[PDB]
């Protein structure tokens, strides 16, 4: 229940995330836009910062989400270590120019950087993310605001992200008042309707992983793909909903939002300026195996985050593995890196010798994690790229057994027994086969926006704000079709929010 | 009738040759006739089938259907066309295995070797 103890913990967990977001957005402008840090160097510095901040205030407390920096195709999972930088090169050495940013660590111009992170205190957690964008510099200008706005489909994506974010914020604010809503009381039906029509206006589809949901203590949705739950009220937009919208558990009907509750928003929009046609938007995993295929568009990598399934137990033969398991289970149920578990990781002072100390510890931790993973104690949080499939291949396909195809050597089970589209009787395995079975291997760029809110009378928005996620000014088109019900409602909502009360937590200096 | 010593009228030898024919000979065995329009167009009665050829059925229960070939299963002595499938109630579709002697071609997939084959067999193109 929303006690003072609960909500001030939420606040002090949130604004740490806010100031760390400011730190990263600081550093990236320092590095690229200003007169050069790589992705994995940003990540552990951000986590060091967050823990150094956490120490001052406050027993279970730490990083829910390790800071993830997706670039231009990846829906989620990219957050590598310093161990893996040469490995990424000598794996992707023969591939082509795409994914050069994520491979090398140096970011390019026009590169759509989706940052995300989160922090938790006693199970009360706050996630946040922001799609920012790189654009080259002005040199003749004195102040050098960097030159050019964005124009294309990525601009579409950013616009849809921000607009969907503000609209759902306002909707969940009107959840307090059964009034101050255009009748054009609140339901996942309405939420999915307004966000889908925004996506359709901007020609940017919703990604399967996106959601809006309730939160409770220790139960946020940090994983959302591995661990299960019976009591989960919230909305998702996956391939089943895509096919249903083309036609015409997570129940959406018996769901009306109430006072005194904490919610997570997480929206992912994949742009369509090419593609030519109607088609599906699904996800494909990234493995470390160069040898499964010959094509150059594929990315080869190793995920850094893990999560451990405390239900299972197995004595290890290996001292290093058992010590690392001690270090793990003394942490919590949230995902983690190997760098988080170490002796010198927060970097009270920072030099090269401490990074070297961390690297040696990492060399031991990978050996421990080998045995901890060969037994099914810990699993990887997968790296997922958005990939497009036209309906032509799917409808012309041949699936000799539908609703019965497992994938049988997928290790997690829950991404195995999925059945994304029950109609047409195709499963994830045959969908992967069809996605690969075509020279229309079109991968989409994606934009991401994540916030945490709580309903008391005001909407207390524990993340976001204008300091945080002010958008990179851009130049998009398809800017919001008027002459419909829902668009009138959305504009009335945006005007009426200026009076509804939205409190917003500021970052820490 | 037969007027050569090279060749045999032996059922056993002929059946053995058919059933142990390699793929290079199964290509020419699995030949399809052309429609009257394509016959007037080119000046040729038949061709060996291939993958991207649009085709039409004229015999069997799946008659009057048409589509482009999705596979040529030389091992099974058949071809797999799309839009001809036995759909099970769950959602599964299996292709019907057709023989190209029944099929008739409506449109071809033309490249240099196929053009040369037609010019060789006496096609005005």
């Amino acid at each position: 229940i929303l006690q003072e103890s609960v909500l001030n913990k939420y606040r002090t967990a949130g604004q740490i995330a806010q100031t760390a977001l400011k730190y990263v957005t600081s550093l990236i402008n320092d590095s690229y836009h200003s007169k050069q840090l790589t992705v994995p160097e940003l990540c552990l510095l951000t986590d060091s910062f967050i823990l150094t901040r956490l120490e001052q205030y406050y027993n279970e407390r730490g990083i829910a989400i390790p800071t993830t920096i997706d670039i231009d195709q990846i829906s989620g999972g990219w957050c590598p270590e310093i161990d893996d930088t040469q490995n990424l090169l000598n794996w992707n050495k023969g591939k082509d120019s795409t994914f050069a940013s994520s491979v090398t660590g140096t970011l390019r111009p026009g590169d759509l950087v989706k940052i995300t992170l989160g922090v938790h205190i006693d199970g009360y957690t706050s996630e946040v993310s922001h799609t920012m964008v790189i654009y080259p510099v002005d040199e003749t200008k004195p102040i050098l605001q960097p030159t050019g706005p964005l124009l294309g489909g990525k601009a579409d994506a950013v616009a849809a992200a921000h607009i969907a974010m503000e609209t759902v914020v306002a909707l969940l604010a009107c959840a307090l008042t059964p009034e101050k809503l255009p009748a054009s009381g609140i339901t996942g039906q309405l939420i999915r309707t307004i966000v889908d029509t925004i996506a359709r206006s901007y020609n940017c589809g919703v990604v399967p992983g996106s959601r809006v949901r309730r939160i409770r203590r220790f139960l946020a949705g940090q994983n959302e793909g591995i661990v299960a739950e019976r009591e989960y009220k919230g909305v998702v937009w996956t391939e089943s909903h895509q096919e249903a919208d083309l036609l015409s558990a997570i129940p959406s009907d018996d769901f009306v939002v109430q006072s005194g509750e904490v919610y997570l928003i997480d929206l992912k929009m994949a742009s369509l300026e090419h593609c030519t046609k109607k088609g599906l938007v699904t996800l494909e995993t990234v493995d470390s195996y160069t040898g499964k295929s010959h094509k150059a568009g594929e990315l080869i990598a190793r995920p850094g985050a893990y999560v451990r399934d405390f239900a299972q137990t197995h004595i290890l033969k290996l001292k290093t593995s058992r010590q690392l398991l001690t270090k793990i289970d003394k942490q919590g149920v949230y995902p983690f890196k190997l760098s988080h578990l170490s002796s010198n990781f927060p970097f009270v002072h920072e030099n090269e010798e401490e990074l070297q100390s961390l690297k040696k510890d990492l060399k031991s931790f990978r050996l421990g994690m080998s045995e901890i993973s060969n037994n099914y104690l810990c699993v990887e949080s997968p790296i997922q790229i958005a990939r497009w499939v036209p309906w032509d291949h799917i409808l012309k396909a041949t699936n000799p057994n539908g609703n019965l195809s497992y994938d049988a050597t997928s290790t997690l089970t829950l991404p195995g027994h999925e059945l994304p589209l029950p109609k047409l009787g195709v499963s994830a395995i045959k969908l992967k086969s069809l996605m690969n079975s075509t020279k229309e291997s079109i991968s989409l760029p994606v934009a991401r926006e994540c916030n945490t809110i709580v309903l008391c009378p005001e909407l207390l928005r524990l993340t976001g704000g204008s300091k945080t996620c002010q958008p990179s000014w851009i130049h998009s088109q398809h800017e919001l079709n008027p002459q419909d019900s829902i668009v009138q409602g959305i504009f009335q909502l945006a005007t009426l929010a200026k009076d509804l009360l939205l409190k917003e937590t500021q970052p820490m200096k | 009738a037969k007027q050569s010593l090279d060749v045999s009228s032996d059922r056993r030898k002929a059946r053995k040759a058919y059933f142990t024919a390699p793929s290079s000979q199964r290509r020419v065995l699995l030949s399809a006739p052309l429609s009257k329009e394509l016959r007037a167009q080119y000046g040729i009665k038949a061709l060996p089938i291939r993958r991207d050829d649009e085709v039409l059925v004229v015999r069997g229960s799946k008659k009057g259907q048409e589509g482009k070939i999705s596979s040529v299963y030389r091992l099974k002595f058949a071809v797999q066309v799309d839009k001809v499938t036995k759909e099970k109630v769950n959602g599964a579709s299996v292709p019907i295995n057709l023989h190209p002697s029944k099929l008739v071609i409506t449109k071809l997939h033309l490249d240099k070797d196929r053009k040369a084959l037609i010019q060789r067999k006496g096609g005005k193109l």
Binding site: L246, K278, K423, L424 | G91
Partner: peptide, 16 residues
Amino acid sequence: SSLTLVKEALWSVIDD
């Protein structure tokens, strides 16, 4: 023959 009907409707929607 439900897959027949839903594929027919889906062809209808994607062709236009």
